[PDB]
Structures are given as C-alpha cells and as structure tokens.
Amino acid sequence: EFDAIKIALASPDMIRSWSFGEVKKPETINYRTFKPERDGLFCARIFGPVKDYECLCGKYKRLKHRGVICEKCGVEVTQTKVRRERMGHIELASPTAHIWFLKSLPSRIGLLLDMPLRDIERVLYFESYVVIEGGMTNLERQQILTEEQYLDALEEFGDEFDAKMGAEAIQALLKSMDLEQECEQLREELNETNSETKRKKLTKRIKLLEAFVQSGNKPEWMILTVLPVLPPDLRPLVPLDGGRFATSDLNDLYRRVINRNNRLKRLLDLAAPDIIVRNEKRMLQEAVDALLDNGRRGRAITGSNKRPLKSLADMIKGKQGRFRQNLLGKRVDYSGRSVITVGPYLRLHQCGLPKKMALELFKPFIYGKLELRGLATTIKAAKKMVEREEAVVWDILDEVIREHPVLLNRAPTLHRLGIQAFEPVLIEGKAIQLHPLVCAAYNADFDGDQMAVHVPLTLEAQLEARALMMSTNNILSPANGEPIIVPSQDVVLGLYYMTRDCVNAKGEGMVLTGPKEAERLYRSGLASLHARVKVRITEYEKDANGELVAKTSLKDTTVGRAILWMIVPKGLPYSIVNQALGKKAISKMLNTCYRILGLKPTVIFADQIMYTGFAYAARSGASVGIDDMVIPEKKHEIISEAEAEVAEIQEQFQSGLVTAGERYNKVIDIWAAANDRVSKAMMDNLQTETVINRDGQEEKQVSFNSIYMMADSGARGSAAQIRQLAGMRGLMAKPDGSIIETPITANFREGLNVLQYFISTHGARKGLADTALKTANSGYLTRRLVDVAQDLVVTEDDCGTHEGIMMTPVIEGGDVKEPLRDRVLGRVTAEDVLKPGTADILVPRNTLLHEQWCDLLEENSVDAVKVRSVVSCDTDFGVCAHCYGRDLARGHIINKGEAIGVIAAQSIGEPGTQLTMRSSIQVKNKGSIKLSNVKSVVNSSGKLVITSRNTELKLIDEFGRTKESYKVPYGAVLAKGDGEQVAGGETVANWDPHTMPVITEVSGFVRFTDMIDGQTITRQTDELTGLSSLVVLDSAERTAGGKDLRPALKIVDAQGNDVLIPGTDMPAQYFLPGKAIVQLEDGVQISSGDTLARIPQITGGLPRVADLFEARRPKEPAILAEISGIVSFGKETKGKRRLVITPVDGSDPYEEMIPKWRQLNVFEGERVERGDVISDGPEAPHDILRLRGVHAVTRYIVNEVQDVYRLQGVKINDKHIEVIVRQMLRKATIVNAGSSDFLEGEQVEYSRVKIANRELEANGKVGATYSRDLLGITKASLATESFISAASFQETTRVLTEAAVAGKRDELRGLKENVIVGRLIPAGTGYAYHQDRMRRR
Amino acid sequence: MHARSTGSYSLVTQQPLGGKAQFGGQRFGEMEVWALEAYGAAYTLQEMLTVKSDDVNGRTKMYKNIVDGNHQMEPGMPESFNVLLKEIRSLGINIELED
Amino acid sequence: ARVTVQDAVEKIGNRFDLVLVAARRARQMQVGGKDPLVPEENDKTTVIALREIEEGLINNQILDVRERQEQQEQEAAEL
RNA sequence: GCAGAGGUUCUAGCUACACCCUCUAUAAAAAACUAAGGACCACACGA
DNA sequence: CTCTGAATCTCTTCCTCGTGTGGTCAGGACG
DNA sequence: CGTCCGAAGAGATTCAGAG
Ligand SMILES: NCc1c[nH]c2nc(N)[nH]c(=O)c12
C-alpha cells in the first residue's frame, strides 16, 4: 500500500481536520451508571460507540442502522473498533508553546529568532516582556524589557510600542519574521564573517531557515492553539479491580489541562484582574508542558505515591515505550518454554518435545485434521475431543508432527546460531531434550537452563526452517571458518580411553583378521581395548577423481583403534585413527571428513562418533578419587628451601644491603620459581608415573591416572587446574592488584588455612563482580554494532573497482602473528598479483582465492597480495558479492541478499562476553637487514649513528619473507651495515634506550648559534662524564634568555667559516632540545657523527573495543604534522608554545599551539612530513583518516581490534570488522561546491555526493570535492537519512524534533524500518519480492 | 512448562499478555529478530511479527486457513504501529503513510 | 524425510530462491489438485516438493511452463 | 437473517471477521458454522 | 583584543529473558 | 445522579589571554 512515511509539523487546520469532536468537560465517566460522559475524555458522540452496533441510549441498534445517527443519545451506530482511531481536539484559550521545540538540544524557536533560550524561557512563562513591533522608539523589535521597565516605557510612550508577555508574544514574533529576507541577510553576513566561530552559528541558522522555507511548514505552527487528544481506547481507564475503574496516568494530565483551560476561559469572560489571568495562563502552559513532556522543565507532576506521571513523550522513548518494547520485540503466539535435558538417543536434526506441550502448540492442526478425517463435526466437538485427551488425538498428533520443524531458542541469542530449527520427537517427560552436540553452539547448559519452542506455521516458514535453519545445515560458524559441532566432554574421554596403548595387556601380538574380529575379541573378553596387535585394514583413498581405490595392508595398531575404524567413512585414510585421539584430533577428523567428503556423510560421522564415545566412556568407568590426586614428594623440600631463601632476603633487608622494593621483588621472584618447580614435579609424578611389567624388565608408560586422562585428552580441565589440585595454588593477588608476598602453599587436596581462604576469596569475588557487568557491557556493545550496520545487504554482483587494501602478514616484532595464508583466504584479488619473478602473472585479476590458490602464493613466497575490501566498494546502498568475498559459513561466493551487516555485528558482539572488562634489538634467525629512510653518517669511532628517528629494522630472510620488524630512534648506534647478512642472536642496533643523542651530520667546528652560555647552554660541572658539560636545559627549565636564544648548533671552521650541510647551502644547524647534555665546548673540532647532546628518558579489554569502534579521542592525542614543512618555534613558549611548520615551496604557515607540559619530540630546524609524530602518544583515528587515508585508518582499526581479540584466543575474520568500518565513514563534508546544489558546510551522504558527481561528470560539468569523515558508531547510526531507524536507537525526542522541523520522508528500504512496518525484509527470501516491487515502480 | 496456541489480547491488541498465570507467549526479543535476520529468514519474520502477534484481520484469517488445510498468510499491518502513529499524532507532529 | 538439503541447493545456488520455488510447488500440491511427480513416501507436501526439486523434475522454468500450459488450457476452455 | 422474524445447540451466538437454516407475524421443526478486561512501583531468585 | 584551547554546564545512557511475591493511585462534599 | 470541588562520554556552553 504505502511506499514511504512522511513526517511534518502539524497545523491547527490539520489538527481540527483530524478531530472528530471537541472535548470540553474535564470528567471521564459516572461512578453510578458507568456510562461515557457528555463531553468528557471518555465520550461517545465525539469518539464512537461503546458497544458494537449499539447506541448509548440503547435505542434502534438494528445493526442494519450502521451509518445512522441516533438523535436520542447523539452517537452514530457503528463498530466499537472506531474508538481507537478517531481523535478529538481541545481549543486552548491562550496560545501555548510546544516544549519539544522550545527546550531541546538546539532550541528550535531560540535558533529561529536568534534569541538566547533564557529570555524566551522568561517571556514564555510570563516573567519578562519582549516588545514586538518596536517602532521609532529607542527599543527595537527583539528588545527584552523588565516588568518595571515595561511600565516605565508604557508611561513614556503609548505609541505602536507593544510589549507583549506570554506565548502570544512568541507567536506574533514568529509571524512577523520574514524568512526570505533573513535568509539573504544571514547569507550576506556569512560572506562578511572571516573566521569559523560566527560561521558555525550562521550555517546552523541558515540551514534552519532553508529547511523551513523548503518543506510545507510555517514558523508560527510551533505554538499550539488546538491540542489534539489520543483516541480514548488507547488510554484505557478500565482496571475493574473492586470497582475502582481508575488507572490512567495520561487521563489525569488531560483532565488537568482541560480544567486549567476552562478556568482560564471563565476568568477571561469575567474580566478578572490581569495578574490572575496571567497566573492562570502560566498554569495552562505548565499543564500543557506536563502533558507533552513531563519532567523537561525541571519539575514533575506527580502524586501517586510521589512518582512522576507518564506523559505522551514517556510512552515513545526509552526501553519501555512503543518503539523498543512493542514494535521490535513483539511477543508471539504458538510458543512454549521448559527446561533442557540431554537425551543422547536423539539424532542431530531432531530434539525432544513433551507431549503435553505439543498437544497445545499444535492444537489448530489437530482441529483441522480431526475435522478432515470426520472424527468431529464442529470446532466445539473437536475441542472437547482434544480436552478429553482421547487415544485418537495422539495418533492424529503423530501425523501433524512428522515433518514440522520447531525453532528452539535460548534467551541470550548473541549470534545467529542461537535460534536453530529441529524436527520434533515426542517424549513423555516435561522437558525439551537437546542433542548433546548442539549444546555448544547454543552455549546450552544443563544446570536448569530454559529454552523457548516456537512453531513455524506457513508453508514458506516450514520450507525455510528446513533449508536455512536446520541443525544439519549449520556446520561452520559464520565468523570463523571452524566447525561448530565439536565433541566436548564425555565422547572425547571415551575416544581417548578407547584409542590408547598399554605395554602389556591380555591379547598382545595376535594377528587379527579385521575390525569385525577385533570387536568380537573385545566383546568376548579374550583381549582388552588397548593392546598392540596386527590387524589388516582396508583403507579407501579418493586420489582418483571420484573413484575410491582400495588398499588392504597389515597396519600395526591397537584393538581399540581397530574397533573405531568401522565408524570412520570410506574416504578418509587410516592415520586419523592411529593417534591418541584427544580433542583437537577429533575436531580435525571431523573437519577432514567435511573437506574430503560432502556434508551428508559428516552428520552421520558426528552422530556415530558421539554414540561410540558415550558407549566406551560408560564402559570405561573413569572415576575420580582422592588417591588419584598425587602430591609430588619433593613439595616439602621445595617449600623449605623457598622459605630459607625468603629468610635470607629478609636478613639482607635488615642489614640494609637491599631496599624494601628490592626485597619485595626478590621475594616474589623466588616464590614464583618455587611455584614453577612444584608444578614441574607434580606433572612429572602424574604424566608418566605408571611402570608396567613388559614381559620382563618394567617399562615406563603414559599414566592412566583419571585426572591425567581428563586433562591430557581435553575433556574438562587444563594443566593449571590440575596444578591447583596437587601443587601449590600460587601467588594470589590483593584487590588493588599487588601480589601478596606470602603465597598459598596448600593445595585443594590438603587443608586450606583461614587466611589463605580469605586471600582466595579476594580473587573469586573480583572475578564474579567483573563478570556481572561484563554481561551488560557486551549486550550494549552488541546492540550498538547491530544498529550501526543493520542496512547492509549484498545487492550487486561485481563492483568493478580496481582499488583495494594490501594484505600482508602481521609481525609485531617477535614473530608472525598471522600468516598471509589466513588473511587472504576467502577474499578476491584486487588486481593482477604477480610472483617475485618479474613479468610472471601468477594469480589473475579477479579470482576468489580457494585453499589451493592460497597454497600457490605460499609456494612462490608472495608476501603482499592486493585484496578487495568492503571499504573500497563503489556500489551505492549495499556492497557487491566480489568485494565481500567468501560466505565463511558455506564455502562459496556470497549469495546476493545475505545480510552481511547483522552477521558481522553479531560476530563482533558474541566474543565480547568473554573479553575481560578490566634497547638491544635482538634477532631470531639469520637473514639480511633493511632500513627505510636512513640518515646514515659514520662517526669517528666507526659506528652507524643515524639522524633518522622514525626508521625501522625490517629483517628479510633469503626467501624475502619479512621475519621481524623493529624501530630505531634518533641517533641509534647500529652494529651491522644495511643490506648485510647479519649473524644469529646478536643485537643489530645496540643503542642506549634512555639517552637521546644529538649527532653531528657534518664535522668541523662548533659555533654557539643562539646558545649564549648560562641561559640555554649551562656548562655546569658534570662529574658524570668527568668534565663540565654544556647541558641544555628544558624549554621551560632554562631562563627567559634561554628561550629567546633557541639552542642551535652551527657547523663552522677554525676561523668561524660556516660549513654547510652537503646538499643545502645553509650551514648545518642542530637545534638541540631540552635536557640535552652537550659535551663539545665552543671552539672544538668535531667528527661527522660525534654525539653532542644526550637526553636520558591504556586498557585492553571491552572498553578498548568500545573506544575503538566509537572513535573516542585519547587522553593525549599524538600531535601530527598537517603539512610537510620545516619546523620553527614561533615564540618563546609564551603561554602557548607555537610551531611554524611551513613548506619549502608551499607558503601556508600552519601553526599549532602545543602545550608546554606536552613533550615536543620534534626539533626546531628539522623538516617533518605530513603524518609525522611531533608529540608522542596514541594516534587519534580522525587524524589518521584526514592525514593518510581511509585505507590507513582501516588497517589501523582492524589491526588494533584484532590485537585486542587475539590476546584472549577468539578468532574473527577481518571482513566483519571492515564492514563496520565502512558503515562508520558514510558521511563526507563538502569542500568545494562546484556546479552542484550542495553548499559548503554540509554533511552530505557519501553515496549521494558520489551519484551527483557521476551525473555531473557524465555531461560537461565539474563535480564536487569532499572530505571523508569518521563518526562514532553511536553517532553515525544517529545521522542516517531515515527518521524511523534512528528513532529506534537512542534519543527519540531529538530525532523526532529534527525530522519534524525538516519535514523528512523516510523511504524505508532498510532492514529494521521494514521490521517496524511489518513487511518482508529486503535481505533474506524477501529480496526477490522487494526487487520485483522496485521493478514495478 | 507453559505452551499456549492463543489467548486474550492486550490493550495494544498484542495477543500474548505474557507469563504463566495468564496464558502468554515467550517474547521474540530484538536479539532473536537479529538472529533471524542473519539467516535468509524473511517469511518467518513476517509471520512472527504480523500474523502471530497483533493483526486483528490476520490472526482470524490464518486460524480459519489452518483449520481448513492451507497454511497461507495475509500480512496486514501491526496494531502497535497504528498505536504509535496515533501517539505521535497526538504530540502535535503530523506523521502519515504516504503512497 | 529429507535430512540435508545440500542436494536440493545444487539446483539453486541462491538458496533463498530455492525456498521461494518450493513454496509454489508445495502450495500447488496442497491447495491445488496436482498429484506429485515423485512416489509419495508418506511425506508432507514440503518434503515432497524438495525431493522433486532434487531429482530435477521441478524448477522455476518447468513450473512456469506448466503454468503457461494451464493458462492456455483455460483459454481453450473459455472459448 | 433472501428482506423482516425466530432458531436447535456446543458460554454468548443477524458482525467479532462472522455464518447458515427454516418460516410469513411469531415462534418452532433441523444439521453445518467462532474466541471477549490487564495501569504503574518495590523486593527476591535462576541461566 | 578577539576568538586559541581551556574549562563549565547541563543531558543522555547503562543485557535479556524467564520464575514469581507484596504494594498500588486522582478528589469529598453539594446543590 | 451528576456536578462541582556513579561514570563516562557528548553536547551544549562560556571564558579567555597572547602574539
Ligand atoms: N449466530 C447465529 C445463531 C444464533 N443461534 C443460531 N442457531 C442456529 N441453529 N444457527 C445459527 O446460525 C444461530
């Protein structure tokens, strides 16, 4: 029907048009006859009939009389449902202003009149006088006058001077104001203004004026003169508890307003004193304010146990209004809820469902089939048959349940795997059974967790809950390409116990025929599960294309492994089931089955694995006993020796040899060493303790300890948890964070002392308290991420662009964190990437990199592959298929339609729950070294001291792969030449980290250029170097003359002949910074590299991710250069230290006011380039974006987010972060308007400006120059072009007001705006329908 | 355990009041809506937002269809959206469904 | 009873379209009087439609052609 | 309810989306048709 | 000497479902 | 029988002092 929703400003004529009556009386109902009031809020002739097809006076309710108006009562016989559609209006005696526009973020009416909000607040509430239509007198139109001042002015001149008071004054002012004349005047003043301070207000005011003149709105419509009322049904007033009949917060406010209006009318007609009339006007204005938005002025109308009343505005915003509680999260029918149970007998695609629950979930189907089969005739008879629970009913239910999937759903469904389809299997209990394997994707738990059962109804729903959501089709997680069905606890223990070996068990050396004989031998009892034998096994290999070749051979393996071979399908080889088969082994087995074979055999393999694991874990009888926890025997000796060391350290502290901090550190270190030794001893006494008689001398074997079996396999429990049970607990921490000196030297098997238990309670309470708020923080972050990327659907196929990000292996400096074989797989090449061999095109321009293609790049050792990224796509309103890459959950190219916004938002939101809420550069291997931007100058000593301060040490091996990367600061002493094969384990650059030496670029003589001694040069006796050194004090440390004479070191000769830097005619000058120990006194020969000076020198949890995604500025942003120019101190740090950075040819003297306390890393004579750190600190994302580019910001934010996530262990593909980054930088500010209609200061959507530029470039016109902007996710989502999606996120009132003023029209097309409307979302199976609808239009 | 196929409607006309004491339906919260949107789910979202919760001309139609044999659906428009439209219109802001 | 629909999605890579093209077949077998082209193995209409799609008997083009033939027959019936 | 009227029953039952039957002045012979009020606040608990 | 960067002042937001318990209001004469 | 009677950041602001 409708194609778009349009918002605007309501006119009094329109308000009267909506109204179907005129509410006058401040009553609701009669508490005797309980009938609609004559002219009250609950009326009948004004709004509609109370009972269907019946009049109030109960006269001719024929029902054939509809559209007839009974004159006895005054109502028209119609349907009752018309009482929730028709509205009424109240005629205000005096004009009243709308609080939503008066008191908001920009103060709409204040901005329009260019008057401070305080004066408007005063005059609106009848306090002060604004004199409209000033005239020839002293005061003007917009002058503000005091009460006594108003009286004096009136007594002075009684001319057209009109000092009005109340909202009538504002109405008259708005009416008198001519928008067009103000428009041109404001534009002229904007041209006149030179700076941007006044320009900001000018632009805002001109934008408001243009918005008012564009849309069909009037500036005087904001002052309400006719107040509409909600339809009566919408405000119920029908509790009917003990006859109370009185529960409407809204109704009370309406009665207040009506009573005030009636009293004002009575006083006005009675010609009451002006003060009384004004007081009643104030009361009316306050009542209207409370009715619209209660609590905005500062006071709150209340009285119900002193609780604020719920106004109309409170019923729209917040988490309880009809925008996030009843429009998004609609409660549904055909639903259930119960507790979970294991039920291992189930297959993978089905689940348990209680009979009593199913008989109520599927009642309509039962009615239908009962009527069809003739068992019952009427719906009442079928109802009775159902309630009687007759035997026939169950048989019918077994037919309507055969292939009817249900959507089992947990409460905190973070990722898409939360709600999964399942075929029902009817059971007799009272709990929905869940297949054990799918208890991991759900995050399902069996400590009383509750699930919800929904029932798809339509044929499309039943087909979809079979081909899109069934548990069999969800094998790979959407975020990371890893299996989601992983054997967790019991099956892995059973398989581990099954596939092991004992050095001497019954039935050793026997030559078994086959797996059948192995099973027969184990079941009979003539042999044991784990005993090395020789059994022939037929291994099927699919090396031939689609052909299974049989290879029968006598492989040496145990009985248990041979039994498991039957479960394994044909295609897989035998080496998978010959190992110990822990947990990673089982996961890899499942993954290899999914790779070599199809999805169809994988499900059966998983089910058989689970069955066999359960059976052979039950047969094992693996139990934990006190005797199993073996305490290492050397524990007491280790503890005694550690205590002796502690006593020795205390003795040294008493003698004064060491300090308190040194003593503390030494005690901590020795206790940590003791803990390490205890853990090592415990492990050595548990892992291989068993010694068994191998037909002769005893032989050591991997132990069969139940704890060790539960820890080595991976069922439940890591090595640290085993350590806490036999070894010492460790050094526990104090609440603040300090490590307590005395560690807990008692395990859990032994007794724990009272003090030790208290120290443990510290950490336990800290952890629990952290999790309690971790949950909420993760929830909020996930909600923001979902709302920022809701409208991203892959519409087009190929973007056709030629740009893309450059993916390279990331090396922090120690090792390669992520190889290129993982950041490129699943992505499409941006261009023709070629192998290191020149003119050798290895990979074509546009090819999806499958596993084989990635292997080819690794074989040729390519370490730089250009990859198309979703931030480089050009298709407007949705990314293309090729730019995105692989589905990451299916293995093929992404199908047109799959919503990649919600998927990525959930993928970045789900791991957030487990994320915590709170020198000598060495070399690893042998290879060549590289140095970029190197200022190499060899000193007299013969060392490679480099003036360059932002250069790096990239060690490249013989194969070209970058093994490691480092950084060397100003004047770094090197040890190896650039491009020279270095040795192993040596220090490439052994510079002193503390000092900051200022070396000589050129040799010669020293001249004190602007360094008169005493002020900046201070040759105090330096006993550190054995000679008085001319230490340059800090910029503020030195005297005023020191700042006046900026420390600079010129190069001269014996006769003061200035020697220039080779390349530039100007003499070489070294502008030394503060705290610089200059050694060479004036008139001393220097070497080309001799060190002159010497300067001895954030959270990473969920808040870090939130700050990264919200683009929050750090505490001390890194001051970077806005242009490439020579630095020069503007002044002597007088208040704000200036820095004149002007280019060589460029004349622009960009000046930045750097605070004095901020450390200035730059010199006073260097030449920084655009994007060079001047003040050390965190780099703000906005500066990175505006300086380097969008690709650089993307590479920064993705890398930082991945670094935060990689620490805990979770893995997320980078494209999920990249789509969020793309959704962030959707806005672009216009720099040059060109020939388009865009203004200068205007945040226009990037897609719109790109479309306009393309249209202009198609013909002979110029486009428009823009500048990309990076907003936070909480701000970019709030600045969309739709007023019904932004109003669903935050600050509903502000968004609604801004939309209403501008008269915007949302064209839907989103993925949430259609959820609100209630039609097909244009993402999933509704994409075809929506594109057909667009085709029709 | 609590399963209800149908029950008395609320003031907003949403059929599930909620809870066990008064026959109610489990809330399909925003999180579950996002989880459905992640899949190709589009028809089940419509049938869980319009014809299952609040559509006075849709629920009865679908009940009659179900008890007759064909599992079709008439989309309609949620009653809560009309309630929202009336609430905003009563605020002095004119919002309309343009065609 | 179709457990996995991988064989069915071989016909329609989009997968969203596969649901749309099977809904038409399921409605034709449920509402309309059209007999299934595959041996009815005591399965509901949805599974029958999916199985028919797997064998290559039902797709968008074949179903549209059958609808066109029905339209031509209706034209002949109405003279 | 063919229109008006009455209606078996299986609350109530020409509208709630409704629907059907027989009958000619007014009720009485008969089967098939469908789901009604929920305003706010504190406290406790589970995954 | 007028707007730099630097305070200053109000404003909005803070998981997601269940299981439940208890307490619950405008304003009483009046002609 | 009515009828009257902490927090954490962001916006949204000034204040300003130097070059
Ligand atoms: N709702 C109509 C109605 C009331 N009583 C009825 N009795 C019968 N036999 N048939 C009906 O249709 C009705």
Ligand SMILES: [Mg+2]
């Ligand atoms: Mg649990």
